[PDB]
Amino acid sequence: MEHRAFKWPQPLAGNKPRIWYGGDYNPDQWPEEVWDEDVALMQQAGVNLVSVAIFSWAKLEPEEGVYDFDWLDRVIDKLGKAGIAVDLASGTASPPMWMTQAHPEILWVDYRGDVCQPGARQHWRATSPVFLDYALNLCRKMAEHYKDNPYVVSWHVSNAYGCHNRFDYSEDAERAFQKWCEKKYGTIDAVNDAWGTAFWAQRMNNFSEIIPPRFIGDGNFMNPGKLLDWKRFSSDALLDFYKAERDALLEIAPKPQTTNFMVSAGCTVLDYDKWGHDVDFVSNDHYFSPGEAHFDEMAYAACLTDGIARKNPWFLMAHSTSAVNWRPTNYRLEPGELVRDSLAHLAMGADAICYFQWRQSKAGAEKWHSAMVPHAGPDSQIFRDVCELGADLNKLADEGLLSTKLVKSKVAIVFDYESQWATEHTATPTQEVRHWTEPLDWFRALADNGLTADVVPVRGPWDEYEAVVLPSLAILSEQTTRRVREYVANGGKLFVTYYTGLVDDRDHVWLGGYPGSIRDVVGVRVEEFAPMGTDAPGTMDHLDLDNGTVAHDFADVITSVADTAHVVASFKADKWTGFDGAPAITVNDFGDGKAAYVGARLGREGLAKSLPALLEELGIETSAEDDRGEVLRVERADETGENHFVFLFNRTHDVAVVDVEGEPLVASLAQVNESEHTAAIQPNGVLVVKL
Amino acid sequence: MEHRAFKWPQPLAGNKPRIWYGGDYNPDQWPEEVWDEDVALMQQAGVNLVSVAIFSWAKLEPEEGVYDFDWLDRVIDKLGKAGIAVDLASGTASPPMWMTQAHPEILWVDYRGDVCQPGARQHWRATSPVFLDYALNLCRKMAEHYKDNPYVVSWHVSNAYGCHNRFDYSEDAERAFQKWCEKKYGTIDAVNDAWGTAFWAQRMNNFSEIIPPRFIGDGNFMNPGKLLDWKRFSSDALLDFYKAERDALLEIAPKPQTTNFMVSAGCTVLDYDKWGHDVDFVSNDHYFSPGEAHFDEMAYAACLTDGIARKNPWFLMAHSTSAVNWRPTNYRLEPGELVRDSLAHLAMGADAICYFQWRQSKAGAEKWHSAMVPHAGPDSQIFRDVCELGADLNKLADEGLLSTKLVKSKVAIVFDYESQWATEHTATPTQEVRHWTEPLDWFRALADNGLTADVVPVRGPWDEYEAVVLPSLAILSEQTTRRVREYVANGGKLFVTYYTGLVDDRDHVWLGGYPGSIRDVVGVRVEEFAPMGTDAPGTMDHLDLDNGTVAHDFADVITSVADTAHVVASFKADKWTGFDGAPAITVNDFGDGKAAYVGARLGREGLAKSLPALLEELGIETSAEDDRGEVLRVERADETGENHFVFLFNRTHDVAVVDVEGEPLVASLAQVNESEHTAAIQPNGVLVVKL
């Protein structure tokens, strides 16, 4: 896999490079006189880019073969005249009513054969030929019309593919899946082997016997190999649609182009790292996680985004000023979080900061979603903070932040979309264990130990790092196995955890003892698992460790430890459980490297407490200060190292005090003491320094 | 109802009778070189029977009308020559893809009309004539081919009927249900009366107006008499299918034949006692209940299996060496439980001990289900315990265990599949009360008081016992009523609980006060119920009793007690409830016997504490020992008494001390003190002795 060449949206003629600042703009939802008020307010706020026409198909093509562009010409002109750049959409995110009325075969079909209707959005099949013809047609009309518009700086292709239409079970999907399987496997016997079809009379004579994983009765168990391929296929079918639209636009109007991802700790609707290879620049939608996890999970997701972009600058396409509309309980943001959240994504390497949306809708299903201009209007704390943020971004651009990169960490935490899919089967050891939670737990625990990790997709250069975490990385292919073995052999410092390396990329178990492909590297052998929980009276729901930590949900049964290895921590338990004195945490010497195995789920807190002794043995340096977990430190720098920025975020509900090590440029809820060269950072506060 | 003559699978020429030991064997999932390792490991383990071809249809008939037997002939010859017998499947458990592609009408239909697809197993309609054709054809091909094979000791017809295909709502089912109703009732007027169809305008003019209980809207209320008959019909249709396959194998290849049941405390997909009349020997699958109930519920289930078998030896077709795959959290087994669990089924009368499965699948939906040979291979604690168990079963057969029977208890606990169905309606007094939990509660509480009960299906000879429990036995027919009355009148000691005798076998309520067919027998009259729970603030969630116990979920409102009866325990409550000082537990003198009435759910704990007084009133003797409930004592003996075995299982997490009353044969996590003639049984331990 090669990436496309990097391309970034360029300034309007006569403008200098800025951190792009703005949001989705939907003037089609407002009387025309509002657009001038919009433009005045945008200039006040320091907004310099908006994303237009994303769901405007029914206005752009109001009946088949009739096109209406004048309204959009006029808004683009207003914006451009005022010095505001337009990120223009294909307009193909969701079809108009006329089209699905005429062609119901466009509508995706669920696992039971029920047809998703219009009434919301993105109700189209990824593999519909009819819908592709309509999408490519609008793409060509749009590219033809805006080819020479100097105010349009980039293409926003469709919108968040697969958010609603990830899975289709129609005849189109059935045929496409068959062809996808022929292309991957060549022969039906290679499919029979991969999926283990000798089990339960599933063996197929030919590729026409491959059906999608449709309804099989509630609570019954689908073929796991097949269901993993179904997820890979579904991602790939949408990726092919993206490529088609992308290609139809660029053939006519070559401009920097992206499509917006949905990278967050727990969102795996697509293999976003694979998709990263086909965008010109990575753009992402991220919304805060409610409660205590808000800051850490956002910094993590932004970190992953940077990792998908291979440390190139990236584009925050969407986040919220305050509440969203789509949770059961739509918590608002607290004072300071607007500025802080935006500066967090920026610190993780974004050169653009954009919201959904500019102006809060007064009608429709997202009327309750926050905006930059709330229902309350610009006499509001939200808009004041938006303007403050505008001025902050202008300041950081002035001081040279643009094109700097997220500094390389000591530690790469590995993420694999496919490993997450493997852990989603309904007949694994426990539904309570998925891939995705572990890398996040480790990011938080390393931050508690004063270390900001990088998060690196499994295809990416994790093997170039001082230290690497494999966090519940269920899949290890032959290839990844070899990369792991050699990494350690040649000086690598590895952490491996439970639920890592169970299977290969066909979802076949590595035999002989878990983790079956790398027992030599970790220096342990696991014969079986001990899932934990509380779903009946008297189930085992925890295991204490002799290092003052407690395991929940899952523990390995380690039955041997190599001679090159030693036990760092052991379980304490009732004798009849088998776990008393059993190994929990181990470190192994392998070539010139070391590998630690963490044989149970310890959570953030457990990991955080377990880590000092492991980091010491593996030779990973951190601060000794007991306050090192209070702030998250995030650095951007150019290649020289001359333009070097440090972002410091309070992670706590206490006042955090830090050294100021340069010129302070931005201070949200932070007060510097010039003479003592110190700063007190309030809760939800941030200080930005240039070294 | 007649049972079939008992037949048991016989040894291979030249072998002595043994406790059949082994499991499901799936060579078709492995390279043929692996079969040699399998056979060597089976011999090391003392395995002497395997169950083959259960899901092998796609290999035996890889296309319509093409048969491939050679692989199977070879595997069978490898086994038989190594002294391992073969329980051969009909292969008809689940159809291959080519068959359902060609004949979609085979596929069962859910209540909403959505067709169950292939992708897991058993996706066929019980009443499909085309599927019957295919299944009988393969039966005959297999019978014709293996009728003179001397290594095939029995037939395993299909597999676990109804586990996935209990209910079908297709046109086939509709027509079959009409004919079923006409056979049972004769006239549409008799159906109308049974189902109470004057209510809600449901009266039918003819049999063509009967439809299955299909979708009526979420939360709406099906006609209860029809639903009960639907569950009766569903079990009967699968039974007719089983009999057709059976008769087709046996007309060609008369060998001993069974089909595996799923008897456990809570599983009632079929009337397994009824199905018990059509097997030659009873076989069963049972998997452990997680947590505290593991040991007790397994013993209870084994006990019920023995009851269904009418005290003939029976075949444990499946259980697990450790974790299963199909729970949300798949807990492992603790040290010693492999052996103990097997010995529990044995103590309760099994002459065969078999596992799912011999070797752990490395691919497919049950890859995480434990086995006799784990992924880790034969160098494993599981394989060592499998080998130790094999030796123990050889030892026990050498000492004369075979064909001994579970000793007749003082107490029969009555179980009625149909009564559980009656309690399943959505408009009962409370969804918290079902038939099934009460017999289990009584079994455990009787064990707390040092008595091992028998569990006897309602059709079975419970009226021959010293004492009898009717536990939430919601149906009492006229015939069962007469049997209960005559039992007590002639000297029986009866325990009757709440939710007993509400309805007849048509689900019509017995009028005049509950329980309305037997008020004279129990000497009480219930006017109404008081369900209890916590589903709004301030609901009544318990009622204390003056014997130091607490009722939950349900209490009866007893408003009169007969002159022949007296009150043993009363409720204590806030006065506004109406329950302060009301009767809770009574005893009535009726003819030469007694009937105790327990008018609330006391649970295991409350029943345990209540039982000393009740046992004394009813003249049922038990130990006086404080420690009488620490251990479950299970006994098997021949008709003479000459071979008399005692199994002693620790039920606790303490060391149980016991008296050794014969020769110790098997001691798992138990230590005999020779000279004191005592033994220390560790948690999860068991001692087996011959007197």
Ligand SMILES: OC[C@H]1O[C@H](O)[C@H](O)[C@@H](O)[C@H]1O
């Ligand atoms: O949070 C809601 C918001 O989510 C994403 O960013 C979408 O692309 C937007 O159109 C909107 O639906």
Ligand SMILES: OC[C@H]1O[C@H](O)[C@H](O)[C@@H](O)[C@H]1O
């Ligand atoms: O525990 C899993 C196991 O359950 C039963 O015993 C079935 O008959 C087997 O085929 C298998 O599915």
